[PDB]
Structures are given as structure tokens and as C-alpha cells.
């Protein structure tokens, strides 16, 4: 690493396969009904598809939530040839729940062809997880190891909006379901003990290029830190941050806390983009009291005087005041404005959480990664988590 300021952005467009978009993210669950049901109301992502006993699948229970291009898959084992996801392992899924509580199993990329992505990845050092399979109807599926037991899943299928999530999934449209304006996955972040081997491995087999980086001096506190690199596809629409702890500090790094509590590497957080995040957050906050998500404590009021100074030329007073009311973090550069906020942990352990983001700018379609990653927001997020961890420590 050289640090955020010294990193010269480039884009060689070195992808080894066509990484078109995030397709979905799959959580392996103790109970898919419980997780999907909670997430549906908490995020405004209505049930869109199911594959389970009611669809003839006795191998696994899968529920798909959608908010526009946000697609969350919740899969749990029952107590085989009927599986709609042939990579599914009941034993592994059962162990996963015990090992982590709620957490991400698979990060799915839509690719031109699953077999080609798999072949190109494995020829450039990817560890195979699931050999390519024809799912029928022109669908391809393959998986390789991403970090720890999280897999990178390749999905290919013909263009067409009649297309099922996957063959064997049955559509759902609930009378009176609503969304809260979530549009797409923005980024998916992994925590690992050692960054350099994982970054080399993933960039190696994907051809994904460095989009950004952050050292402890960029985003850490007096007491703790991390190092981060973000890998990106050619269009910089698929963004995969990677964090490692830094050791020898006054406190333990929140990334090491994660590894300790999670029981190994995994997805720390998933960022969900909205075209009006302030509106989205108003809806999500209304559901907080009745089992929805909560948000990390906002910065003090003086922060929001800074937001005026730094971003008052792009954001209206109405938006800035709403940012303050909702506890949103604001960062800007010459291309974009970043609005970001983090939930409290979404399961039992202080591990996995979610992020709501809006990128303002770079209108052309919007250019991928508009506004990049904000050093200012990053350092506030990090401080936020550190403070959260201290509160937990204060009650021992």
C-alpha cells in the first residue's frame, strides 16, 4: 500500500471474463423464513421468488427478496435431486449457521457465461468450489473460493425479463408489497487476516483492478486501524473492498474483532445504493421499533456544519438537515458526493452489518463508482465502529 492520496487511479480493463453486474448475495441461514421476513420489512425488499417444499424442492428452503436490482437470497437446509441450487450442501449450511449466525455464503456475479468465468478464473489460480453446471433454460452456474468459506458465484442466463431467478424458482408478487427505493448493490466488503495474499489472489484470477486503497493513517484512530484495497471490474460497477486489521495498536482492530467473533474471514458489510437514500432511510427507520434495523450513532451536530461548508454547493439545506436528522455521513470530491450510513449488526454477533449509500454525480446512465470511496466517510465509519465496540466493552 502507498495510502489513499498517493494511489494513482488507473483502469487497465483487465477483467478475465465478462463481469456484467452483481446478480445476488446469498445468506446461509438457520431459518430462511425468519431472515427473509425480517429483511423484507427492514429493507423494503418484497419476496419475489421461492424454491422450497411448496415448489417441489425438498433439498433446501430458498427465499428471494428484490428491491429493483437488489436481490437477497436466503437459503436454509431441511432436516436432493430436487435442489434448484445444485451447489447447495445441507451439512455445510447447517455448520455455517452454527459457525457464524446470520452471514453471507455467496457473492453472485452475473457473467456472460458461467463456465468461461470458471475456466478463466481457475487457469489464473482460483480455487474451485463448484464445477460448472447447466441449470436448464440457458442458465449456467459455477463457483470459486473468494475468501474463507465465502464463494464467488458465476451466473449466466439469456436476456429476457420472463427469466426466473433460477430454473425451479417460482415467482411471488404479494398484494400490497412496497419497496423503500433500494436500487442496486454498490459494494461487498470482505475482512481477512492478511490483505496482500487475498488481494493478489482475487485480482489475479478475476483481472479486477485496484480502484482505491486506505491505510491506517488514512482512516484509523489514535487507538486502532485497518488497511483496505478495493478491487473493481472494467466498468467499476462491481466493487469488492478487502480489509485487514493492523496489529500493535492501543486497542484491537474492529477487523480483528470481526475475525474473532465470526470465526474466520467473511463479508463484513454489503452496501445498498438508492437514488434517494434520505427517503429510503425515513422508511427503514419507521420499521426500526417493530423489528427492523437500527443505525450507528451519528456524529455530533458540528459535523453537519462541516457538511454545509464541504458540500453546500451540491446539497440543499433540506438535504443537509435530513442528513443530520437521519445520522448520514457526507463526503465529496470533484466528481461525486457520497451519502453513507451503517446499520448496527444485523444478526446476533457484532460482525455483519449493512450500508445504505447514494452516489450523486457523474451523469453521462451514471458512471460506476461515482465519488469513489470517501476517506472522510471511511474514517467516520471506522470511528463509529470503534465507539460501538467500546460500549460493548463498557458492560463487561
Binding site for a second copy (CB under 8 A): 29-42, 44, 46-47, 52-56, 58, 61, 76, 78-79, 82, 94, 97-102, 174-178, 261-263, 286-292, 345-350, 391-392, 395-396
Nearer to Zn ion, 171 or 305 (CB): 305
Beta strands in the chain (DSSP E): 19-28, 47-51, 60-67, 70-77, 103-111, 128-136, 139-147, 150-156, 170-171, 182-191, 209-214, 226-232, 239-245, 266-274, 329-332, 336-342, 353-361
Which of positions 349-368 make contact with Co ion (CB under 5 A)? 355
Contacts of residue 177, Cβ cutoff 8 Å, sequence gap at least 6: 46, 47
In the complex, the smallest distance separating the C-beta of residue 116 from Zn ion, rounded to whole angstroms, is 4
DSSP state string for 80-95: -TT-SSTT--HHHHHH
Nearer to Co ion, 191 or 224 (CB): 191
Report the C-alpha gap between 113 and 119 in whole angstroms. Answer: 10
Considering only residues 271, 277, 281, 315, which one is a binding residue for Co ion as defined by CB under 5 A?
Answer: 271
Residues interacting with Zn ion, by CB under 5 A? 99, 113, 115-116, 127, 140, 149, 247, 331, 374-376
Report the C-alpha gap between 188 and 271 in whole angstroms. Answer: 6
355 binds, options Zn ion, Co ion, a second copy, none, Cβ within 5 to 8 A by partner type? Co ion
In the complex, the smallest distance separating the C-beta of residue 113 from Zn ion, rounded to whole angstroms, is 4
Cβ atoms of residues 255 and 317 within 8 Å: no
DSSP assigned state of 246: -
Nearer to Zn ion, 150 or 284 (CB): 150
247 binds, options Zn ion, Co ion, a second copy, none, Cβ within 5 to 8 A by partner type? Zn ion
3-state secondary structure of 55: helix
Contacts of residue 92, Cβ cutoff 8 Å, sequence gap at least 6: 28, 149
Nearer to Zn ion, 115 or 356 (CB): 115
32 binds, options Co ion, a second copy, Zn ion, none, Cβ within 5 to 8 A by partner type? a second copy
Nearer to a second copy, 116 or 179 (CB): 179
Nearer to a second copy, 46 or 204 (CB): 46
Per-position b or e across 52-86, b if 16+ CB within 10 A of its CB: beebebebbbbbbbbbeebbbbbbbbeeeeebbbe
376 binds, options Zn ion, a second copy, Co ion, none, Cβ within 5 to 8 A by partner type? Zn ion
Cβ atoms of residues 343 and 352 within 8 Å: no
Beta strands in 215-350 (DSSP E): 226-232, 239-245, 266-274, 329-332, 336-342
In the complex, the smallest distance separating the C-beta of residue 32 from Co ion, rounded to whole angstroms, is 25
Region binding Co ion by CB under 5 A among candidate stretches 100-108, 155-163, 175-183, 264-272 = 264-272
In the complex, the smallest distance separating the C-beta of residue 260 from a second copy, rounded to whole angstroms, is 8
102 binds, options Zn ion, Co ion, a second copy, none, Cβ within 5 to 8 A by partner type? a second copy
Nearer to Co ion, 96 or 382 (CB): 382
Pairing of strands 239-245, 182-191: parallel
Polymer length in residues for the chain: 396
367 binds, options Co ion, a second copy, Zn ion, none, Cβ within 5 to 8 A by partner type? none
83 binds, options a second copy, Co ion, Zn ion, none, Cβ within 5 to 8 A by partner type? none
Amino acid at each position: 500500500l502507498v495510502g489513499h492520496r498517493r494511489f494513482v487511479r488507473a483502469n487497465p480493463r483487465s477483467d478475465r471474463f465478462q463481469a456484467l453486474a452483481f446478480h445476488h448475495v446469498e445468506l446461509w441461514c438457520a431459518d430462511a423464513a425468519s431472515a427473509a421476513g425480517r429483511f423484507a420489512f427492514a429493507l423494503g425488499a418484497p419476496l419475489a421468488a421461492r424454491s422450497d417444499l411448496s415448489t417441489g424442492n425438498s433439498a433446501h428452503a430458498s427465499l428471494l427478496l428484490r428491491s429493483a436490482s437488489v436481490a437477497f437470497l436466503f437459503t436454509a437446509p431441511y432436516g436432493a435431486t430436487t435442489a434448484s441450487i445444485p451447489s447447495f450442501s445441507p451439512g455445510a449450511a447447517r455448520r455455517f449457521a452454527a459457525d457464524h449466525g446470520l452471514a453471507v455464503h455467496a457473492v453472485a456475479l452475473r457473467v456472460a457465461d458461467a463456465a468461461d468465468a470458471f475456466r478463466a478464473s481457475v487457469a489464473a489460480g482460483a480455487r474451485p468450489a463448484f464445477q460448472p453446471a447447466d441449470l436448464g433454460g440457458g442458465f449456467g452456474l459455477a463457483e470459486v473460493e473468494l475468501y474463507g468459506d465465502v464463494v464467488l458465484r458465476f451466473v449466466s442466463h439469456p436476456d429476457g425479463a420472463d427469466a426466473p431467478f433460477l430454473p425451479g424458482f417460482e415467482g411471488v408478487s404479494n398484494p400490497g408489497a412496497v419497496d423503500y427505493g433500494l436500487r442496486r448493490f454498490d459494494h461487498v466488503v470482505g475482512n481477512v487476516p492478511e490483505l496482500a495474499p487475498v488481494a493478489a489472489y482475487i485480482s489475479g484470477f478475476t483481472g479486477f483492478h485496484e480502484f482505491a486503497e486506505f491505510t491506517a493513517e488514512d482512516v484509523g484512530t489514535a487507538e486502532s486501524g485497518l488497511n483496505s484495497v478495493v478491487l473493481a471490474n472494467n466498468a467499476e460497477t462491481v466493487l469488492l473492498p478487502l480489509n485487514e486489521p493492523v496489529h500493535g495498536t492501543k486497542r484491537r482492530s474492529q477487523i480483528q474483532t470481526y475475525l474473532d467473533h465470526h470465526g474466520g474471514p467473511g463479508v463484513q458489510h454489503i452496501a445498498l445504493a438508492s437514488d434517494d437514500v434520505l427517503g429510503t432511510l425515513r422508511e427503514m427507520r419507521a420499521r426500526s421499533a417493530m423489528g427492523g434495523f437500527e443505525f450507528l450513532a451519528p456524529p455530533p451536530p458540528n459535523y453537519y456544519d462541516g457538511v454545509r461548508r464541504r458540500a453546500g454547493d451540491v446539497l440543499s439545506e433540506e438535504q443537509i438537515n435530513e442528513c443530520q436528522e437521519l445520522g448520514v455521513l457526507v463526503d465529496r470530491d470533484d466528481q461525486g458526493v457520497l451519502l453513507q450510513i451503517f446499520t448496527k449488526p444485523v444478526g446476533d454477533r457484532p460482525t455483519f452489518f449493512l450500508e445504505m449509500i447514494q452516489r450523486i454525480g457523474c451523469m453521462e446512465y451514471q458512471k460506476g463508482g461515482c465519488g469513489g470511496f470517501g476517506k472522510g466517510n471511511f474514517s467516520e465509519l471506522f470511528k463509529s465502529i470503534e465507539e460501538y465496540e467500546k460500549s460493548l466493552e463498557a458492560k463487561q
